[PDB]
């Protein structure tokens, strides 16, 4: 009903002849973080989390850090008349969460706010508080744990719609996990494969994941020479296979 | 909970002030082999085993061979009134698994049975079936795979109790691995180091394992001249450093 183990998804059935509808739960994750909500008050509480080390701790650290940032970005706005729509977008690769507000009257008309939770293109290490480095590190670890939770659920739960589903919507998380770990305290080939091939079907993923190949040395060195991202002055991602895919905005809604 | 990748251990916490409790999983391995249990019905099934070549195949071969041997040793006993205690012992260097049975009444009184799975001191090559050479070769490979599993888990999972834990309980496996590979179809210095220094601490092992030194030539030649084992007519092992440790019986219980 409400409660589900962190990172897991559900597959629902739309009918128009039936098509699958992936409930990835990314919206809900982001929403909780924005509200500063604590782990014990989430749909995620009360499952065994020995597979996800430090989930509750890092989740609450991250929740606070996101909450405070939100407040800083919204203290300079008057939002007493407005309501946050149940739509969150993510722009990449700074993991820029974007909210849209509209007037309680309509539901001056609409207002937008963006917070880059994991800024990657323009950073300061030396001129950054411990609060910020600790908050970021917690956000990233939460994302990693979400993806592990996703993968573990996928592994244990075959479904005949799997062939039609892909890791497409997880991309911004994956890109930020790879980007942050690289550009601030190596590249995890699992994360990098899934970010690169956002068209990875679920059944194929399950069967292949454990035999995934490492980053080719020509790519590793092209990365050290030129970054991971290629700015067009719109950002391109430097894939594990040398592809250069456009990282478009993803939109998430409440399910 | 139940399921764990082959060879891996868990560290639990007793309190009396807390002390670590190593769950090596050796008992469970042996128990399965005795029951002839097949890989697909073990706690070990459903992980990727590309790191452990032929695990399921060799495990099932070995499982059958141990099961049949058990039955041969127990067909000449009446055990309908009795129950196998959850205690298995191993005597070395023939990898002699010892079970103890007691009456369902008590739980004539107790009965003992011993099967040398990998006999090393007194063997026949020419007068031995293919069934036996294939069963033995499978048992030995399973043991080697268990140790590889153990080492891999150790490498990837630091723990602050490591400094207090040692490879002590793995000794009979290690001695039989080295003994069988030598006396029947060279010496692996990793296996030999760990068999010799059954006091190797986990943290030290992890840091040092990859830079382990080869057998000194004076030892290699003392081995070719005199065996590996020294019988006292109680067996002594000829260590990689020239030590001559007594190989005592080890006792394993269900965790």
């Amino acid at each position: 009903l409400e409660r589900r183990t962190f990172g897991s998804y559900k597959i629902e059935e739309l009918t128009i002849k039936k098509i699958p509808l992936l409930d990835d739960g990314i919206f809900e994750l982001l929403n909780y973080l924005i509200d500063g909500t604590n782990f014990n008050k989430t749909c995620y509480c009360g499952f065994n989390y020995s597979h996800l080390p430090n989930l509750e701790r890092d989740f609450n650290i991250a929740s606070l850090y996101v909450r405070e940032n939100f407040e800083i970005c919204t203290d300079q706005l008057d939002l007493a008349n407005y309501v946050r729509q149940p739509n969150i977008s993510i722009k990449s690769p700074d993991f820029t969460v974007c909210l849209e507000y509209v007037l309680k009257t309509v539901v001056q008309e609409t207002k937008f706010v963006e917070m880059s939770l994991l800024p990657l293109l323009n950073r300061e290490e030396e001129s950054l508080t411990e609060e910020i480095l600790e908050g970021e590190g917690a956000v990233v670890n939460v994302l990693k744990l979400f993806i592990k939770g996703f993968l573990m659920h996928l592994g244990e739960n075959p479904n005949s719609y799997d062939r039609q589903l892909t890791v497409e919507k997880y991309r911004p998380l994956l890109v930020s996990i790879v980007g942050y770990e690289y550009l601030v305290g190596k590249i995890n080939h699992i994360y990098y494969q899934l970010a690169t091939f956002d068209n990875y079907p679920f059944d194929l993923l399950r069967f292949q994941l454990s035999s995934l190949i490492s980053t080719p040395t020509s790519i590793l060195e092209r990365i050290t020479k030129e970054g991971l991202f290629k700015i067009i002055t719109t950002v391109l991602f430097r894939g594990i296979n040398g592809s250069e895919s456009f990282l478009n905005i993803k939109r998430y809604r409440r399910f | 909970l139940e399921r764990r990748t082959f060879g891996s251990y868990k560290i639990e916490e007793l309190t009396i002030k807390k002390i670590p409790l190593l769950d090596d999983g050796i008992f469970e391995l042996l128990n399965y082999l005795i029951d002839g249990t097949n890989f697909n019905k073990t706690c070990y099934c459903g992980f990727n085993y590309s790191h452990l070549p032929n695990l399921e195949r060799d495990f099932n071969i070995a499982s059958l061979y141990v099961r049949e041997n058990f039955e041969i040793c127990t067909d000449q006993l009446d055990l309908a009134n009795y129950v196998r205690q959850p205690n298995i012992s191993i005597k070395s260097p023939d990898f002699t698994v010892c079970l103890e049975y007691v009456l369902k009444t008590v739980v004539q009184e107790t009965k003992f049975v011993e099967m040398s799975l990998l006999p090393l001191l007194n063997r026949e090559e020419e007068s031995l079936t293919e069934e036996i050479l294939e069963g033995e070769g499978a048992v030995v490979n399973v043991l080697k795979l268990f140790i590889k599993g153990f080492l891999m888990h150790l490498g990837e999972n630091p723990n602050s109790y490591d400094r207090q834990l040692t490879v002590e309980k793995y000794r009979p496996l290690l001695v039989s691995i080295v003994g069988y590979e030598y006396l029947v179809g060279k010496i692996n210095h990793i296996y030999y180091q760990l068999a010799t220094f059954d006091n190797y601490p986990f943290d030290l092992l992890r840091f040092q394992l990859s830079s382990l030194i080869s057998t000194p030539t004076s030892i290699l030649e003392r081995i070719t001249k005199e065996g590996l084992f020294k019988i006292i007519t109680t067996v002594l092992f000829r260590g990689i450093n020239g030590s001559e440790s007594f190989l005592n019986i080890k006792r394993y219980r269900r965790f």
Binding site: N141, M152, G155, D162 | -
Partner: peptide
Amino acid sequence: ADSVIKSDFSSLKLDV
């Protein structure tokens, strides 16, 4: 999909 093989990814090297 009751016949599809399940995989346990709980031990994958995911830097967590």
